[PDB]
Design a protein around this ligand. Structure first.
Ligand code: CLA
Ligand code: CLA
Ligand code: CLA
Ligand code: CLA
Ligand code: CLA
Ligand code: CLA
Ligand code: II0
Ligand code: II0
Ligand code: IHT
Ligand code: IHT
Ligand code: 8CT
Ligand code: 8CT
Lengths: 173, 99, 33, 150, 215, 30, 137, 80, 73
């Protein structure tokens, strides 16, 4: 609350529109982090089961232009390109939702006179169901899980996919 | 039809017809020069249109008489169109300005 | 994920995204009452 | 005779000329989406974006870096999408900067009206680019500009 | 409110007067455009899709039943979308038949006229209702109550046909079988029949590499 | 020879310096 | 006061006239009486015919209005030209012949604004007026 | 707006007032010069900064000085 | 590390080039450092400077960069 108000004072432009450190930003980032944990699980499954075609094939620079060449004389693999385009799909959905939101949906950028949602605090009420409390709880948990997964991958030396698999118990692959 | 804010304009297509005939009937005057063949300007244009319609997608090659005939015929036609509209609207039956 | 990917990951960012966002935000700031 | 003062006002910085105030000109301008009557700012944006994203795919498709490749059309569509996003961003920043939050009832010169216009323009532009992509990918005459008939 | 979905708010545009309106519009598509004619345009789109789908489903079934004299001799034994592809393969510049092109020509005249009609309806200038082309030779729907019952029946059967024809097309793409065959064979993937390429080959890219290809 | 972990430590220090630069920019803008 | 019913000098139109800024911020006007129908030069460009009697003209800038007034005074012998400024609210104000007599000749009632009680050499230095509110005067 | 100032050196020639394309300078009464008149700058908000007043000044160092300050529509002479 | 062995023969490279506008001819033309990717050859003399200072490995340069980041902070 104090931090929220102080930020509203420091950066009136972002806070007035709902950007920055706000409850709306927390909710949106929790949404994206949950979707991202799902995406990591799904890519783990696909890579483990070999569902990605020509995963280790290096894209041709002659066909796909200089963009197909990586930083240090390396080539982007078909798997990386496929996953990137999969992300491009949801990114275009994102741009369309942000500029032209559904009438019922929550908007990324809030109006000038919008009423900020009440800061939940330590934990929202445990309202079990498709509730805005459950959404925030699971979004916070997913964001923390993303950070923990990256840190475990860097520390233990395993891949992010390997760490997700290990944690899930090797059910994925 | 208003040519401007409140100025009306007849836009009679019979002026177009008369100017077209005024330029095209003289164009029938034949010439034995290679460009025209033996025929006149209008007839040569018609012949070229048919000849290059037979070969539709392919354009008349550079150096074909078609381009020169087209340019000359349309230059004269546009000149006659301008003069005919001038005559019909300024020297015509309902003009106001003494030109 | 190796460091060799970092140029291809970053140069488009630093050269098209950072300038675009900076220009938009600075535009909003300079023309603002 | 044909050139006169604008709106019968001799001292306004304009002249009434055939190009500026003819019947055809007035009809065309008043029937374009930016001026037609009854359209919402959203529908204006939809029509305009549809019309613009269509023509955008061609220049990119036929003259872009990957034009002699097998991915020329997809590359073209992608580059059109990028330009459309950039222009939508331009529209959004222009709206937030120029129009203050007073409500003039969606007249396209309001914050809400311009937001609707830019949203519609984005949607219509992406849709038109996709439609052009489909038509080009499926019709040979468009991929060859008619050089299939030769 | 939505009767269809008892736990979701009815969209404002769905008053319930429109035939077939049970309050089902979870994405609030009816409210996407503030213009008055938007909902009417959506209704006309639904009617048109339902009609085309009903005809397409009936055509798939009847083509399975029997074929017109000489079509077998012309296009072989191709079925469903492959017949469209075959006719178009023979409809080249140096081609004899113009089946699909003739169909497109006449339906396109009808469709440009219908485009003007729907423009007028959208603008509010015309009093035409969505899907009303004045086609009623037998006068089934002359009575307003009869017109309403028949409109509901038409929209319902159109939705069912819209689902069914898509099912039929995808079944044919998978198994090379028409509707009546696919109905007959249940372990269809055992008796799958050969089928020419769709004409949109890229859409089956993931069928084998990413997706299972039980055949 | 320079490992990804090393590049990541460098990036983390860069991020800390960016945060401090934003703080200094705010304090100077006042 | 200004009467908005005075006819105008039958100008044929130009692209040098006022623009949207005239409708949004400020629009100047000039009124003058002419003994006959002469041809004068618009400050925006082109020729215009002034009427026999009162003539009202709209411009975008006070400098344009005053240039037209100077033309009338020197070329012709019209010196009853009055200049006004109009805001979108309808707040027409009176500017030239401010006190009814042109500024070039002294008139009783004016108060000196911006007059200094020394020569320019007596101005203070910026070092002397630095970090202070003093004025270089 | 530009800051226009007049000094004791004024001789009342009035040429500064007559040279101004706007109406920023006017003659007022004075006792420090033979003419009995001094220039004054009441409508300084209309000043454009042309310095025509400065040009039309006969005193060794100018009695009228224009110090160009903040710019506005009128100062910039923007008809748009 | 390969410049501190034959500093009079090896050209010192400043940084790698990643430009999506380069053609294959340009990528090849800029792979002169024996590094297998396009590069810029330094003209600042930092190589000679650091070699004289006592820098021999890339880890030395990396530690210096870490310290200078810490000092900027
Ligand atoms: C320094 C940064 C930078 C970067 C990273 C790039 C990158 C690119 N430029 Mg270059 N460009 C730059 C600066 C840069 N440019 C500058 C300063 C100029 C002005 C002289 C140009 C002028 C220029 C031209 C004239 C062209 C390029 C093109 C290209 C492309 C390389 C060739 C190719 O095959 O791609 C092409 C293949 C593709 C599949 C393109 C996909 C691009 C996606 C859609 C980008 C995503 C945009 C994003 C969503 C917008 C966010 C906006 C936000 C910041 C507000 C590539 C996207 C070529 C091109 O095709 O561009 C479209 C091209 O024709 N550039
Ligand atoms: C190219 C064709 C052509 C030419 C050269 C002329 C020439 C003439 N027409 Mg016009 N006229 C034309 C086509 C043409 N007409 C057509 C097609 C129509 C029917 C729509 C008319 C109907 C028409 C009427 C009703 C009248 C004229 C008149 C005239 C004469 C004076 C006005 C004028 O246009 O000056 C033409 C310019 C020059 C002579 C200068 C030569 C400059 C060259 C290009 C250099 C002039 C002899 C008026 C006249 O005086 O009648 C005899 C008149 O009453 N014309
Ligand atoms: C100020 C020094 C400096 C300069 C001029 C450059 C220049 C470059 N770096 Mg960067 N870089 C720097 C420091 C610097 N770097 C440091 C300290 C690190 C370690 C964290 C990196 C790590 C790094 C990587 C991993 C990569 C680059 C890359 C690049 C290239 C493209 C830009 C980019 O992607 O930046 C991205 C930079 C970062 C994500 C972090 C570093 C940002 C620095 C600290 C900003 C400093 C700003 C400066 C002090 C003040 C600005 C002044 C203002 C007026 C604008 C370019 C040659 C990319 C490339 O393609 O290389 C060939 C690339 O892959 N750099
Ligand atoms: C609306 C969807 C649709 C589409 C896209 C097609 C497309 C095709 N049909 Mg047709 N077909 C349709 C509906 C459709 N059909 C219906 C509703 C029937 C049942 C009567 C048939 C029965 C049928 C047969 C038996 C045959 C085709 C065949 C064909 C092919 C050649 C055209 C032809 O001879 O048609 C002929 C079709 C008709 C004369 C029936 C038209 C029914 C009208 C339009 C209904 C509207 C009535 C209303 C009162 C107005 C072509 C791919 C031929 C083929 O190759 O089959 C594989 C063929 O022999 N169709
Ligand atoms: C686009 C669809 C299509 C195609 C490709 C053909 C093609 C053919 N038909 Mg036709 N036919 C069609 C639709 C079509 N038909 C329809 C809709 C009907 C129903 C009225 C018929 C009814 C029909 C009859 C009754 C006969 C043909 C016959 C023929 C063949 C000889 C042409 C002719 O009659 O002279 C020819 C292969 C003739 C044939 O060879 O029959 C043995 C013939 O007698 N057709
Ligand atoms: C419903 C399913 C379906 C599907 C998936 C396809 C798929 C296909 N059809 Mg189509 N087709 C269908 C039904 C379908 N068709 C039916 C029912 C018919 C009979 C009417 C046809 C008749 C048909 C023909 C005749 C041809 C195709 C072709 C094609 C291919 C390219 C289509 C394309 O790019 O369109 C993109 C274009 C459009 C969707 C329409 C463009 C409309 C323009 C922009 C408006 C112009 C207005 C104009 C002024 C109208 C005046 C009226 C005029 C008719 C006189 C593709 C495989 C072409 C091909 O080569 O296939 C191998 C082809 O030549 N189809
Ligand atoms: C994953 C993924 C994706 C993704 C994603 C996204 C959007 C991921 C977003 C991740 C985010 C936003 C992570 C934020 C983490 C914040 C943390 C850990 C804060 C910790 C604070 C602490 C410990 C504290 C504290 C404190 C204590 C102790 C007590 C307090 O009194 C004081 C104090 C505040 C100091 C995408 C969508 C790209 C798809 C992709 O395919 C995969
Ligand atoms: C308007 C009008 C008139 C008229 C008229 C006309 C001509 C009216 C024509 C109406 C028609 C043709 C209606 C057709 C409906 C078809 C449906 C609902 C199909 C559903 C298929 C399904 C569910 C399926 C499926 C399946 C799938 C998925 C896969 C398959 O393997 C199996 C299976 C088959 C089960 C008349 C003449 C009266 C005059 C009047 O004055 C004006
Ligand atoms: C299914 C589905 C979707 C979905 C979805 C959703 C709703 C996905 C939600 C995903 C969520 C909520 C993921 C949470 C992950 C949490 C982790 C990894 C926590 C780690 C915690 C740690 C390590 C804590 C450590 C801590 C412990 C133990 C003790 C204390 C200290 C410490 C050591 C720090 C979509 C949106 C993608 C759409 C799709 O069509 C359908
Ligand atoms: C001719 C031709 C071709 C063609 C073609 C054609 C004609 C293709 C036609 C394709 C069609 C009609 C596809 C339909 C798909 C329908 C779906 C997925 C419905 C889902 C409904 C759901 C989930 C409903 C859910 C329902 C809802 C909403 C609410 C509650 C109830 C519940 C049951 C849950 C090609 C492509 C082969 C190319 C060739 O060159 C030429
Ligand atoms: C001035 C002049 C002089 C000489 C004669 C000439 C004719 C050249 C004339 C000039 C003519 C000119 C400039 C013509 C240009 C025409 C243009 C740019 C036409 C553009 C047409 C655009 C079209 C169809 C767009 C179709 C888009 C569609 C369906 C989009 C649909 C969709 C949307 C909108 C959103 C969701 C996705 C979905 C459903 C796909
Ligand atoms: C690498 C890694 C490991 C595991 C965990 C983790 C998630 C952190 C992961 C990801 C790390 C990431 C994404 C790090 C990102 C690095 C970034 C954004 C680096 C950028 C650094 C930028 C710097 C210095 C900029 C310095 C700018 C300065 C002085 C500007 C000076 C100034 C100017 C120009 C104007 C006046 C004010 C001021 C401040 C004097």
């Amino acid at each position: 609350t104090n931090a929220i108000e102080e930020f509203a004072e420091s950066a009136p432009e972002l806070a007035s529109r709902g950007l920055g450190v706000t409850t709306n930003a927390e909710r949106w980032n929790g949404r994206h982090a949950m979707f991202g944990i799902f995406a990591i699980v799904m890519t783990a499954y696909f890579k483990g089961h070999g569902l990605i075609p020509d995963a280790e094939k290096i894209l041709d620079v002659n066909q796909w232009g200089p963009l197909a060449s990586a930083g240090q004389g390396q080539g982007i693999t078909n798997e990386r390109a496929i996953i990137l385009i999969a992300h491009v799909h949801v990114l275009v959905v994102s741009v369309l939702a942000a500029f032209a939101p559904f009438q019922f949906q929550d908007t990324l950028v809030k109006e000038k006179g919008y009423t900020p949602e009440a800061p939940a605090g330590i934990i929202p009420p445990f309202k079990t169901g498709l509730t805005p409390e459950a959404e925030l709880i699971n979004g916070r948990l997913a964001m923390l899980g993303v950070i923990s997964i990256i840190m475990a991958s860097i520390f233990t030396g395993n891949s992010v996919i390997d760490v997700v698999n290990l944690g899930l118990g090797k059910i994925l692959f | 039809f208003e040519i401007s804010d409140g100025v009306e304009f007849d836009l009679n297509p019979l002026v177009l017809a008369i100017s077209f005939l005024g330029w095209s009937l003289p164009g029938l005057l034949p010439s034995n020069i290679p460009l025209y063949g033996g025929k006149g300007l209008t007839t040569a244009l018609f012949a070229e249109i048919g000849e290059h319609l037979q070969t539709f997608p392919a354009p008349p090659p550079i150096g074909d008489p078609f381009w020169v005939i087209l340019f000359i015929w349309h230059s004269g036609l546009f000149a006659t169109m301008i003069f005919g509209t001038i005559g019909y609207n300024g020297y015509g039956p309902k003009s106001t300005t003494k030109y | 994920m190796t460091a060799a990917y970092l140029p291809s990951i970053l140069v488009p960012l630093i050269g098209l995204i950072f300038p675009g966002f900076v220009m938009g935000f600075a535009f909003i700031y300079i023309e603002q009452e | 005779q044909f050139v006169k003062p604008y709106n019968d006002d001799p001292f306004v910085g304009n002249l009434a000329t055939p190009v500026s105030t003819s019947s055809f000109t007035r009809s065309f301008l008043s029937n374009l989406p930016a001026y037609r009557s009854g359209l919402s700012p959203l529908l204006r944006g939809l029509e305009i974006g549809m019309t613009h994203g269509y023509f955008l795919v061609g220049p990119f498709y036929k003259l872009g870096p990957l034009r002699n490749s097998d991915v020329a059309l997809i590359s073209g569509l992608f580059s059109s999408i990028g330009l459309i996003i950039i222009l939508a961003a331009c529209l959004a920043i222009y709206g937030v900067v120029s129009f203050n939050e007073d409500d003039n009832t969606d007249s396209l010169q309001t914050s809400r009206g311009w937001k609707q216009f830019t949203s519609g323009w984005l949607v219509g532009s992406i849709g038109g680019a996709s439609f052009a992509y489909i038509l080009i990918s499926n019709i040979v005459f468009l991929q060859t500009s008619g050089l299939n008939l030769i | 409110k939505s009767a269809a979905i008892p736990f979701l708010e009815k969209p404002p545009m769905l008053d319930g007067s429109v035939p077939g309106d049970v309050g089902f519009d979870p994405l609030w598509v009816s409210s996407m455009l503030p213009d008055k004619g938007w909902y009417l345009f959506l209704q006309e789109a639904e009617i048109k899709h339902g009609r085309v789908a009903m005809l397409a489903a009936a055509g798939a079934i009847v083509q399975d039943i029997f074929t017109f004299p000489g079509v077998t001799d012309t296009i072989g034994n191709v079925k469903m979308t492959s017949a469209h592809d075959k006719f178009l393969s023979m409809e080249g510049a140096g081609g004899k038949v113009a089946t699909m092109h003739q169909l497109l020509l006449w339906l396109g005249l009808l469709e440009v006229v219908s485009a003007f009609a729907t423009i007028q309806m959208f603008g509010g200038t015309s009093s035409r209702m969505p899907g009303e082309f004045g086609f009623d030779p037998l006068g089934f729907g002359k009575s307003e109550a009869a017109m309403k019952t028949y409109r509901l029946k038409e929209v319902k059967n159109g939705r069912l046909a819209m689902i069914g024809i898509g099912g039929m097309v995808h079944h044919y793409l998978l198994t090379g079988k028409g509707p009546l065959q696919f109905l007959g064979g249940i372990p269809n993937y055992k008796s799958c029949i050969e089928h020419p390429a769709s004409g949109l080959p890229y859409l089956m890219k993931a069928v084998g590499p990413v997706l299972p290809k039980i055949c | 020879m320079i490992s990804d972990t090393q590049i990541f430590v460098a990036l983390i220090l860069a991020l800390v310096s960016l945060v401090l630069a934003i703080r200094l920019g705010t304090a100077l803008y006042q | 006061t200004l009467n908005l019913q005075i006819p105008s000098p039958t100008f044929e139109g130009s692209t040098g006239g006022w623009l949207r800024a005239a409708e949004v911020e400020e629009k100047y006007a000039i009124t003058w009486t002419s003994g006959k129908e002469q041809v004068f030069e618009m400050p925006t460009g082109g020729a215009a015919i002034m009427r026999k009697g009162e003539n009202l003209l709209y411009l975008a800038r006070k400098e344009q209005c005053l240039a037209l007034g100077t033309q009338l005074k020197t070329g012709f012998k019209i010196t009853d030209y009055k200049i006004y400024r109009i805001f979108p609210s309808g707040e027409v104000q009176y500017l030239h012949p401010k006190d009814g007599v042109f500024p070039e000749k002294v008139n009783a009632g004016r108060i000196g604004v911006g007059n200094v009680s020394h020569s320019i050499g007596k101005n203070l230095n910026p070092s002397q007026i630095k970090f202070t509110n003093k004025s270089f005067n | 707006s530009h800051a226009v100032k007049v000094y004791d050196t004024c001789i009342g020639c009035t040429q500064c007032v007559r040279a101004c394309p706007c109406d920023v300078l006017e003659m007022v009464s004075w006792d420090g010069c033979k003419a009995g008149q001094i220039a004054s700058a009441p409508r300084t908000e209309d000043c454009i900064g042309c310095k025509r007043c400065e040009t039309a000044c006969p005193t060794d160092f100018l009695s009228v000085r224009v110090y160009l300050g903040g710019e506005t529509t009128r100062s910039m002479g923007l008809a748009y | 590390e390969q410049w501190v062995l034959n500093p009079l023969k090896v050209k010192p490279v400043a940084h790698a080039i990643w430009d999506p506008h380069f053609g294959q001819p340009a990528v090849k033309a800029f792979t002169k450092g024996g590094v297998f990717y396009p590069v810029n050859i330094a003209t600042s003399g930092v190589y000679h400077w650091w070699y004289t200072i006592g820098m021999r490995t890339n880890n030395d340069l990396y530690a210096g960069s870490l310290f200078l980041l810490f000092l900027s902070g």
